[PDB]
C-alpha cells in the first residue's frame, strides 16, 4: 500500500458554493462557507487555510497560501439528490439516480392511508415538528386513542411516536418496518424511518432510549464493502455506520458532538489498523444549517479548526488525511433544506515534504472511493477516478 491508513473526514453539509446544476434545486446563490465567513466578519480557520482551503476558493478571512500542506480542489456531485445518504453513497463509489424526499407539508394522504390499512391504526399529526413539541401537543391524544404520532423534520425522515405503556415496543417496531417497506417508493422515498417510543404523562413526557432507526442499504456494494471483504479495517465514527446501514463497517464508534468526533478520530490515530477511519462531523448540518444559524455554524467551524494541529502532529508518513463534505446547507438561504453545492477536498500526508498543489476538479464524489480502493488494491468502484498517483 502507498498509505497504510486513510483518515476520511466529512464535515457534514460544509459546501463551498453553488454547483453547476443548482438552479434545478432552487439553490441559486447558495454558498455555505462563504456566507458564514461574511456573517462572521472573517472566519478564523488558520489550519484549514494552511492545508489549502483558500487555494480552493478565497473567502472572508480565508486566504490562499503559497505552499499549502497538502493537495486541494473541489468536488462536483453527479447523483440526483443533495441529501446525506446520496452524498455518502457517492463518496464511497456509487451513483444514485433516485433522490430521497423531504416533506415540508407532511406526507401524502396515499402513503398514510396504506400505513393505516396495513396496521389497523390511526395516524395523527402528519407535519414537520420538533419531536418534543409534538409530544406536548398530541401525546395525550396518542395515549387515549392508541393512534400513532407521525411527523417529519427538515431532513428525509418519517418518525413514529407512541407511548410504551399503550403501544407495545415490539408493535411499534413492526409498524416501523411496514413504514420502511412502504417508503421504498420513489413517490415517498424517505431516508430513515425512526421509532420514537416515549413514557410519562401530559406535561411530563420523556422519549426513551428504545429509539430504533430504519435505514435503506446503499444502492450497490461500496468501497467499504470491498475493504471489509479484503480483511482491512473500516472504522466508522459518528453517523457513518448508520448512513451506510453498517455495510462494510468493521468497528463503529458513537459520538455525541463534533468535539467528541474529533476525540474519536484521535483515538483511531492511536490504533494500529490498516484501512480506513471514516468520520462524519454532523453538528454543522444538524444544529446550524437546517436551523439557518450562521453564528452557531461559524463558531462550530472555528471550534473544529482549532482541533486540527493535534491531528497533524499524530499523522504518520504513511497516513493520508482526506477532508471533504457531502453537500451544502447554507445557513443564510431560504427554507430549511440542503443546498446543491460543490464540496471542498483537501488531501494531506506528512510525507508530502514539498507541500501539495491543485488537483483537477473531481467530477464525482466517487473519486474519493476510487482513490481509497486503488490505495488498498481492492476492486475499483464502477464510478470515480482515483487521484492517488497525483499525491
Ligand atoms: O428530535 P426530533 O425532532 O424527533 O428529530 C430530529 C432529528 O433527530 C435525529 O437525528 C433525526 O435525524 C431527526 O431528523
Ligand atoms: Mn434552496
Ligand atoms: Mn449530510
Ligand atoms: Mn441534513
Ligand atoms: Mn454563540
Tab-separated table of C-alpha atoms and ligand atoms in Angstrom:
chain	number	residue	atom	x	y	z
A	1	UNK	CA	0.000	0.000	0.000
A	2	UNK	CA	1.069	3.585	-0.651
A	3	UNK	CA	-0.771	4.572	2.565
A	4	UNK	CA	-1.270	2.187	5.495
A	5	UNK	CA	-4.092	4.292	6.931
A	6	UNK	CA	-6.535	6.749	5.401
A	7	UNK	CA	-8.454	9.138	7.652
A	8	UNK	CA	-11.523	10.467	5.860
A	9	UNK	CA	-13.395	13.355	7.492
A	10	UNK	CA	-16.776	14.506	6.210
A	11	UNK	CA	-17.646	17.954	7.517
A	12	UNK	CA	-21.327	17.350	7.018
A	13	UNK	CA	-23.023	19.996	4.797
A	14	UNK	CA	-19.928	22.230	4.575
A	15	UNK	CA	-20.457	23.404	0.965
A	16	UNK	CA	-18.138	25.699	-0.957
A	17	UNK	CA	-20.576	27.381	-3.366
A	18	UNK	CA	-23.484	26.614	-5.698
A	19	UNK	CA	-22.922	23.712	-8.112
A	20	UNK	CA	-23.430	23.989	-11.909
A	21	UNK	CA	-26.902	22.391	-11.561
A	22	UNK	CA	-28.010	24.486	-8.540
A	23	UNK	CA	-30.949	26.135	-10.381
A	24	UNK	CA	-32.763	22.755	-10.746
A	25	UNK	CA	-32.794	22.517	-6.938
A	26	UNK	CA	-33.758	26.118	-6.126
A	27	UNK	CA	-30.206	26.716	-4.864
A	28	UNK	CA	-29.006	29.687	-6.945
A	29	UNK	CA	-26.922	31.965	-4.724
A	30	UNK	CA	-26.001	29.225	-2.233
A	31	UNK	CA	-22.596	29.369	-0.564
A	32	UNK	CA	-22.274	27.650	2.834
A	33	UNK	CA	-18.696	28.581	3.853
A	34	UNK	CA	-18.714	31.940	2.009
A	35	UNK	CA	-21.941	33.203	3.603
A	36	UNK	CA	-20.791	32.074	7.060
A	37	UNK	CA	-17.433	33.827	6.528
A	38	UNK	CA	-19.295	37.035	5.653
A	39	UNK	CA	-21.544	36.737	8.717
A	40	UNK	CA	-18.514	36.138	10.988
A	41	UNK	CA	-16.747	39.175	9.507
A	42	UNK	CA	-13.978	36.731	8.590
A	43	UNK	CA	-13.858	33.075	9.616
A	44	UNK	CA	-10.869	32.029	11.735
A	45	UNK	CA	-9.785	28.694	10.265
A	46	UNK	CA	-5.965	29.006	10.138
A	47	UNK	CA	-5.390	25.229	9.959
A	48	UNK	CA	-7.766	24.591	7.071
A	49	UNK	CA	-6.055	27.651	5.455
A	50	UNK	CA	-2.638	26.013	5.944
A	51	UNK	CA	-3.973	22.878	4.223
A	52	UNK	CA	-5.112	24.992	1.267
A	53	UNK	CA	-8.805	25.816	1.834
A	54	UNK	CA	-8.271	29.357	0.468
A	55	UNK	CA	-6.389	27.956	-2.522
A	56	UNK	CA	-9.672	26.219	-3.455
A	57	UNK	CA	-11.569	29.479	-3.067
A	58	UNK	CA	-10.760	32.714	-1.239
A	59	UNK	CA	-13.433	33.784	1.254
A	60	UNK	CA	-13.621	36.360	4.053
A	61	UNK	CA	-10.775	35.572	6.488
A	62	UNK	CA	-9.807	32.535	4.378
A	63	UNK	CA	-6.875	33.418	2.110
A	64	UNK	CA	-4.743	31.315	-0.214
A	65	UNK	CA	-1.243	30.224	0.859
A	66	UNK	CA	1.926	29.982	-1.235
A	67	UNK	CA	2.770	26.469	-0.004
A	68	UNK	CA	-0.331	24.517	1.105
A	69	UNK	CA	0.419	21.492	3.327
A	70	UNK	CA	-1.457	19.149	1.016
A	71	UNK	CA	-3.331	18.893	-2.275
A	72	UNK	CA	-6.634	20.679	-2.858
A	73	UNK	CA	-9.607	21.035	-5.196
A	74	UNK	CA	-13.365	20.795	-5.052
A	75	UNK	CA	-15.818	18.042	-5.994
A	76	UNK	CA	-18.992	18.110	-8.037
A	77	UNK	CA	-21.952	15.868	-7.190
A	78	UNK	CA	-23.186	13.619	-10.002
A	79	UNK	CA	-26.083	11.833	-8.246
A	80	UNK	CA	-29.552	13.361	-8.430
A	81	UNK	CA	-30.118	14.150	-4.725
A	82	UNK	CA	-28.478	16.593	-2.292
A	83	UNK	CA	-29.164	14.535	0.894
A	84	UNK	CA	-26.620	12.879	3.258
A	85	UNK	CA	-27.184	9.328	2.070
A	86	UNK	CA	-26.790	10.284	-1.601
A	87	UNK	CA	-23.579	12.263	-0.840
A	88	UNK	CA	-22.016	9.477	1.269
A	89	UNK	CA	-23.035	6.679	-1.088
A	90	UNK	CA	-21.416	8.598	-3.971
A	91	UNK	CA	-18.271	9.286	-1.907
A	92	UNK	CA	-17.852	5.515	-1.477
A	93	UNK	CA	-18.180	4.732	-5.213
A	94	UNK	CA	-21.872	4.685	-6.162
A	95	UNK	CA	-24.166	6.647	-8.477
A	96	UNK	CA	-27.675	7.333	-7.167
A	97	UNK	CA	-30.387	8.274	-9.682
A	98	UNK	CA	-33.331	8.332	-7.272
A	99	UNK	CA	-33.304	11.167	-4.700
A	100	UNK	CA	-34.583	10.884	-1.123
A	101	UNK	CA	-37.540	13.199	-0.479
A	102	UNK	CA	-38.268	15.813	2.221
A	103	UNK	CA	-41.816	16.680	3.256
A	104	UNK	CA	-42.325	20.334	4.363
A	105	UNK	CA	-46.125	19.849	4.326
A	106	UNK	CA	-46.235	16.337	5.777
A	107	UNK	CA	-46.701	13.036	3.971
A	108	UNK	CA	-49.137	12.392	1.082
A	109	UNK	CA	-52.562	11.026	2.029
A	110	UNK	CA	-51.873	7.953	-0.129
A	111	UNK	CA	-48.875	6.796	1.938
A	112	UNK	CA	-50.538	7.314	5.329
A	113	UNK	CA	-53.747	5.631	4.118
A	114	UNK	CA	-51.783	2.486	3.201
A	115	UNK	CA	-49.882	2.534	6.535
A	116	UNK	CA	-53.274	2.755	8.337
A	117	UNK	CA	-54.631	-0.043	6.129
A	118	UNK	CA	-51.726	-2.388	6.925
A	119	UNK	CA	-51.502	-1.663	10.674
A	120	UNK	CA	-55.116	-1.225	11.841
A	121	UNK	CA	-54.009	2.008	13.496
A	122	UNK	CA	-54.987	5.651	13.043
A	123	UNK	CA	-52.328	8.266	12.300
A	124	UNK	CA	-52.319	11.768	13.849
A	125	UNK	CA	-50.113	14.828	13.311
A	126	UNK	CA	-48.509	14.425	9.881
A	127	UNK	CA	-46.429	17.603	9.924
A	128	UNK	CA	-42.916	18.940	10.361
A	129	UNK	CA	-42.444	19.259	14.110
A	130	UNK	CA	-39.898	19.130	16.876
A	131	UNK	CA	-40.099	15.646	18.407
A	132	UNK	CA	-40.540	17.067	21.912
A	133	UNK	CA	-43.051	19.797	20.939
A	134	UNK	CA	-45.345	17.320	19.135
A	135	UNK	CA	-45.421	15.091	22.264
A	136	UNK	CA	-46.700	18.045	24.285
A	137	UNK	CA	-49.347	18.690	21.619
A	138	UNK	CA	-50.551	15.169	20.779
A	139	UNK	CA	-49.097	12.776	23.382
A	140	UNK	CA	-52.258	12.757	25.495
A	141	UNK	CA	-54.479	12.022	22.486
A	142	UNK	CA	-51.996	9.287	21.462
A	143	UNK	CA	-52.322	7.684	24.947
A	144	UNK	CA	-56.139	7.796	24.980
A	145	UNK	CA	-56.712	6.510	21.432
A	146	UNK	CA	-53.789	4.189	20.638
A	147	UNK	CA	-53.148	6.180	17.458
A	148	UNK	CA	-49.685	6.873	16.019
A	149	UNK	CA	-47.996	10.260	16.023
A	150	UNK	CA	-46.322	10.522	12.618
A	151	UNK	CA	-44.120	13.514	11.940
A	152	UNK	CA	-41.103	14.738	9.981
A	153	UNK	CA	-38.413	17.439	10.131
A	154	UNK	CA	-36.041	19.317	7.847
A	155	UNK	CA	-34.313	16.051	6.808
A	156	UNK	CA	-35.651	12.997	4.948
A	157	UNK	CA	-37.254	11.206	7.903
A	158	UNK	CA	-40.542	9.576	8.874
A	159	UNK	CA	-40.852	9.427	12.669
A	160	UNK	CA	-43.468	7.387	14.585
A	161	UNK	CA	-44.058	8.198	18.255
A	162	UNK	CA	-46.100	6.101	20.669
A	163	UNK	CA	-46.301	5.672	24.438
A	164	UNK	CA	-44.586	2.450	25.612
A	165	UNK	CA	-47.415	1.569	28.028
A	166	UNK	CA	-50.096	1.981	25.318
A	167	UNK	CA	-48.429	0.620	22.158
A	168	UNK	CA	-46.020	-2.234	22.949
A	169	UNK	CA	-42.438	-1.615	21.825
A	170	UNK	CA	-42.471	-4.713	19.569
A	171	UNK	CA	-45.655	-3.475	17.878
A	172	UNK	CA	-44.072	-0.058	17.330
A	173	UNK	CA	-41.064	-1.786	15.734
A	174	UNK	CA	-43.311	-3.899	13.482
A	175	UNK	CA	-45.212	-0.767	12.354
A	176	UNK	CA	-41.925	0.998	11.563
A	177	UNK	CA	-40.779	-1.973	9.462
A	178	UNK	CA	-44.041	-1.754	7.490
A	179	UNK	CA	-43.478	2.013	7.028
A	180	UNK	CA	-39.893	1.282	5.920
A	181	UNK	CA	-41.209	-1.071	3.205
A	182	UNK	CA	-43.923	1.371	2.075
A	183	UNK	CA	-41.382	4.208	1.766
A	184	UNK	CA	-39.250	2.181	-0.660
A	185	UNK	CA	-41.168	4.036	-3.334
A	186	UNK	CA	-39.821	6.992	-5.266
A	187	UNK	CA	-43.099	8.936	-4.693
A	188	UNK	CA	-42.329	8.948	-0.943
A	189	UNK	CA	-38.735	7.842	-0.573
A	190	UNK	CA	-37.611	8.696	2.969
A	191	UNK	CA	-34.007	8.261	4.091
A	192	UNK	CA	-34.927	6.953	7.537
A	193	UNK	CA	-37.971	5.668	9.435
A	194	UNK	CA	-37.488	6.285	13.184
A	195	UNK	CA	-39.330	4.629	16.096
A	196	UNK	CA	-39.815	7.238	18.846
A	197	UNK	CA	-41.163	5.466	21.930
A	198	UNK	CA	-41.950	7.682	24.915
A	199	UNK	CA	-43.176	7.355	28.506
A	200	UNK	CA	-44.636	9.675	31.144
A	201	UNK	CA	-47.773	11.792	31.389
A	202	UNK	CA	-49.226	15.045	29.942
A	203	UNK	CA	-46.794	17.886	30.712
A	204	UNK	CA	-44.041	15.381	31.506
A	205	UNK	CA	-43.267	13.127	28.540
A	206	UNK	CA	-39.805	11.631	28.073
A	207	UNK	CA	-38.519	9.890	24.957
A	208	UNK	CA	-36.839	6.611	25.824
A	209	UNK	CA	-33.512	5.033	24.777
A	210	UNK	CA	-35.624	2.464	22.882
A	211	UNK	CA	-35.387	4.577	19.687
A	212	UNK	CA	-34.722	2.431	16.592
A	213	UNK	CA	-33.655	3.827	13.163
A	214	UNK	CA	-34.613	2.005	9.935
A	215	UNK	CA	-32.240	2.845	7.065
A	216	UNK	CA	-32.003	1.684	3.461
A	217	UNK	CA	-28.904	-0.179	2.351
A	218	UNK	CA	-26.718	1.663	-0.206
A	219	UNK	CA	-27.908	1.013	-3.786
A	220	UNK	CA	-24.810	-1.048	-4.533
A	221	UNK	CA	-21.808	-2.618	-2.859
A	222	UNK	CA	-19.447	0.194	-1.867
A	223	UNK	CA	-15.690	0.577	-1.481
A	224	UNK	CA	-16.292	-0.083	2.251
A	225	UNK	CA	-17.814	-3.485	1.397
A	226	UNK	CA	-14.704	-4.271	-0.708
A	227	UNK	CA	-12.283	-3.200	2.037
A	228	UNK	CA	-14.090	-5.314	4.671
A	229	UNK	CA	-14.226	-8.321	2.321
A	230	UNK	CA	-10.451	-7.974	1.801
A	231	UNK	CA	-9.829	-8.023	5.590
A	232	UNK	CA	-8.979	-4.333	6.008
A	233	UNK	CA	-10.187	-2.279	8.962
A	234	UNK	CA	-13.139	0.046	8.329
A	235	UNK	CA	-13.704	2.156	11.434
A	236	UNK	CA	-16.889	4.238	11.260
A	237	UNK	CA	-17.106	7.237	13.579
A	238	UNK	CA	-20.346	9.101	14.373
A	239	UNK	CA	-23.270	8.803	11.911
A	240	UNK	CA	-21.131	6.862	9.349
A	241	UNK	CA	-22.316	3.357	10.266
A	242	UNK	CA	-25.973	4.451	10.203
A	243	UNK	CA	-25.550	6.300	6.871
A	244	UNK	CA	-24.353	3.080	5.198
A	245	UNK	CA	-26.622	0.813	7.312
A	246	UNK	CA	-23.438	-0.861	8.621
A	247	UNK	CA	-22.357	-2.018	5.168
A	248	UNK	CA	-18.613	-2.690	5.086
A	249	UNK	CA	-18.081	-1.453	8.660
A	250	UNK	CA	-15.724	-3.436	10.957
A	251	UNK	CA	-15.942	-1.194	14.065
A	252	UNK	CA	-18.283	1.673	14.881
A	253	UNK	CA	-17.635	4.499	17.356
A	254	UNK	CA	-20.610	6.537	18.603
A	255	UNK	CA	-20.130	10.295	19.072
A	256	UNK	CA	-22.201	12.984	20.855
A	257	UNK	CA	-20.816	16.201	19.294
A	258	UNK	CA	-18.240	17.470	16.810
A	259	UNK	CA	-15.618	17.781	19.580
A	260	UNK	CA	-16.368	14.171	20.604
A	261	UNK	CA	-15.988	13.181	16.917
A	262	UNK	CA	-12.507	14.764	16.869
A	263	UNK	CA	-11.691	12.845	20.085
A	264	UNK	CA	-12.679	9.550	18.412
A	265	UNK	CA	-10.592	10.474	15.341
A	266	UNK	CA	-7.621	10.950	17.732
A	267	UNK	CA	-8.471	7.531	19.289
A	268	UNK	CA	-8.206	5.938	15.815
A	269	UNK	CA	-4.859	7.699	15.202
A	270	UNK	CA	-3.680	5.829	18.339
A	271	UNK	CA	-4.887	2.453	16.965
A	272	UNK	CA	-2.754	0.028	14.965
A	273	UNK	CA	-5.043	-0.577	11.998
A	274	UNK	CA	-4.691	-0.942	8.237
A	275	UNK	CA	-7.530	0.503	6.208
A	276	UNK	CA	-9.985	3.363	6.615
A	277	UNK	CA	-11.052	5.522	9.536
A	278	UNK	CA	-14.170	7.403	8.456
A	279	UNK	CA	-15.608	10.309	10.488
A	280	UNK	CA	-18.772	12.352	9.983
A	281	UNK	CA	-18.932	15.702	11.843
A	282	UNK	CA	-22.703	16.110	11.848
A	283	UNK	CA	-23.341	19.201	14.061
A	284	UNK	CA	-22.784	21.576	11.125
A	285	UNK	CA	-25.840	20.120	9.389
A	286	UNK	CA	-27.984	19.118	12.402
A	287	UNK	CA	-27.646	22.169	14.653
A	288	UNK	CA	-26.753	25.045	12.328
A	289	UNK	CA	-27.542	24.506	8.632
A	290	UNK	CA	-31.184	23.386	8.899
A	291	UNK	CA	-31.743	25.869	11.736
A	292	UNK	CA	-30.357	28.652	9.484
A	293	UNK	CA	-27.989	29.759	12.235
A	294	UNK	CA	-24.829	31.253	10.624
A	295	UNK	CA	-23.379	32.378	14.004
A	296	UNK	CA	-23.537	28.873	15.524
A	297	UNK	CA	-22.281	27.421	12.262
A	298	UNK	CA	-19.284	29.834	12.191
A	299	UNK	CA	-18.427	29.083	15.825
A	300	UNK	CA	-18.568	25.322	15.154
A	301	UNK	CA	-16.189	25.671	12.172
A	302	UNK	CA	-13.733	27.625	14.352
A	303	UNK	CA	-14.006	25.030	17.147
A	304	UNK	CA	-13.332	22.293	14.584
A	305	UNK	CA	-10.326	24.128	13.049
A	306	UNK	CA	-8.682	24.508	16.498
A	307	UNK	CA	-8.579	20.690	16.882
A	308	UNK	CA	-6.566	20.107	13.669
A	309	UNK	CA	-2.969	20.702	14.866
A	310	UNK	CA	-3.130	17.635	17.141
A	311	UNK	CA	-4.294	15.607	14.133
A	312	UNK	CA	-1.358	16.972	12.077
A	313	UNK	CA	1.012	16.005	14.944
A	314	UNK	CA	-0.218	12.386	15.037
A	315	UNK	CA	-0.279	11.596	11.288
A	316	UNK	CA	2.477	9.237	10.202
A	317	UNK	CA	4.435	9.295	6.906
A	318	UNK	CA	2.216	6.527	5.536
A	319	UNK	CA	-1.048	8.110	6.707
A	320	UNK	CA	-3.307	10.097	4.414
A	321	UNK	CA	-5.850	12.633	5.703
A	322	UNK	CA	-8.825	13.490	3.458
A	323	UNK	CA	-11.232	16.292	4.324
A	324	UNK	CA	-14.447	16.863	2.382
A	325	UNK	CA	-18.229	17.422	2.664
A	326	UNK	CA	-21.372	15.616	1.379
A	327	UNK	CA	-23.470	18.613	0.129
A	328	UNK	CA	-24.138	22.189	1.278
A	329	UNK	CA	-26.620	23.504	3.864
A	330	UNK	CA	-26.298	27.275	3.580
A	331	UNK	CA	-27.493	28.866	6.855
A	332	UNK	CA	-28.383	32.103	5.021
A	333	UNK	CA	-30.693	30.596	2.385
A	334	UNK	CA	-34.498	30.288	2.005
A	335	UNK	CA	-36.341	27.379	3.604
A	336	UNK	CA	-34.759	24.640	5.698
A	337	UNK	CA	-33.464	22.189	3.038
A	338	UNK	CA	-29.889	21.356	1.959
A	339	UNK	CA	-28.160	23.299	-0.852
A	340	UNK	CA	-26.697	21.874	-4.067
A	341	UNK	CA	-23.033	22.930	-3.805
A	342	UNK	CA	-19.505	21.917	-4.716
A	343	UNK	CA	-17.661	20.420	-1.738
A	344	UNK	CA	-14.037	21.062	-0.747
A	345	UNK	CA	-11.389	18.325	-0.955
A	346	UNK	CA	-8.135	18.530	0.990
A	347	UNK	CA	-5.603	15.675	0.831
A	348	UNK	CA	-2.686	15.706	3.255
A	349	UNK	CA	0.115	13.374	4.304
A	350	UNK	CA	3.238	14.363	6.301
A	351	UNK	CA	5.165	12.563	3.518
A	352	UNK	CA	4.272	15.455	1.165
A	353	UNK	CA	7.579	17.172	2.016
A	354	UNK	CA	7.249	19.937	-0.593
A	355	UNK	CA	3.553	20.527	0.148
A	356	UNK	CA	0.702	19.996	-2.309
A	357	UNK	CA	-0.793	21.580	-5.406
A	358	UNK	CA	-4.117	21.927	-7.209
A	359	UNK	CA	-5.838	18.709	-8.309
A	360	UNK	CA	-8.176	18.655	-11.335
A	361	UNK	CA	-11.770	19.270	-10.166
A	362	UNK	CA	-13.417	15.970	-9.084
A	363	UNK	CA	-16.344	15.338	-11.459
A	364	UNK	CA	-17.982	12.936	-8.976
A	365	UNK	CA	-17.683	12.394	-5.210
A	366	UNK	CA	-16.785	8.787	-6.137
A	367	UNK	CA	-13.232	9.949	-6.919
A	368	UNK	CA	-12.629	9.576	-3.155
A	369	UNK	CA	-13.870	5.951	-3.198
A	370	UNK	CA	-11.730	5.206	-6.295
A	371	UNK	CA	-8.660	6.691	-4.564
A	372	UNK	CA	-9.216	4.608	-1.401
A	373	UNK	CA	-9.863	1.458	-3.475
A	374	UNK	CA	-6.693	1.893	-5.564
A	375	UNK	CA	-4.594	2.590	-2.454
A	376	UNK	CA	-5.568	-0.711	-0.850
A	377	UNK	CA	-5.552	-2.787	-4.062
A	378	UNK	CA	-9.262	-3.744	-3.853
A	379	UNK	CA	-11.879	-3.900	-6.653
A	380	UNK	CA	-12.292	-0.419	-8.204
A	381	UNK	CA	-15.751	1.161	-7.987
A	382	UNK	CA	-17.827	1.468	-11.158
A	383	UNK	CA	-17.777	5.294	-10.864
A	384	UNK	CA	-14.979	7.673	-9.909
A	385	UNK	CA	-11.416	8.355	-10.985
A	386	UNK	CA	-8.600	7.907	-8.451
A	387	UNK	CA	-6.263	10.827	-7.710
A	388	UNK	CA	-3.863	8.536	-5.778
A	389	UNK	CA	-0.985	8.977	-8.269
A	390	UNK	CA	-1.317	12.780	-8.198
A	391	UNK	CA	-0.364	12.769	-4.486
B	1	LIG	O1	-35.654	15.135	17.900
B	1	LIG	P1	-36.678	15.052	16.798
B	1	LIG	O2	-37.297	16.379	16.451
B	1	LIG	O3	-37.660	13.915	16.971
B	1	LIG	O4	-35.851	14.609	15.487
B	1	LIG	C1	-34.854	15.436	14.892
B	1	LIG	C2	-33.756	14.577	14.274
B	1	LIG	O5	-33.139	13.713	15.229
B	1	LIG	C3	-32.488	12.643	14.534
B	1	LIG	O6	-31.093	12.947	14.378
B	1	LIG	C4	-33.133	12.580	13.157
B	1	LIG	O7	-32.131	12.916	12.193
B	1	LIG	C5	-34.224	13.634	13.178
B	1	LIG	O8	-34.338	14.332	11.936
B	2	LIG	MN1	-32.618	26.208	-1.984
B	3	LIG	MN1	-25.062	15.490	5.220
B	4	LIG	MN1	-29.407	17.452	6.754
B	5	LIG	MN1	-22.810	31.735	20.012
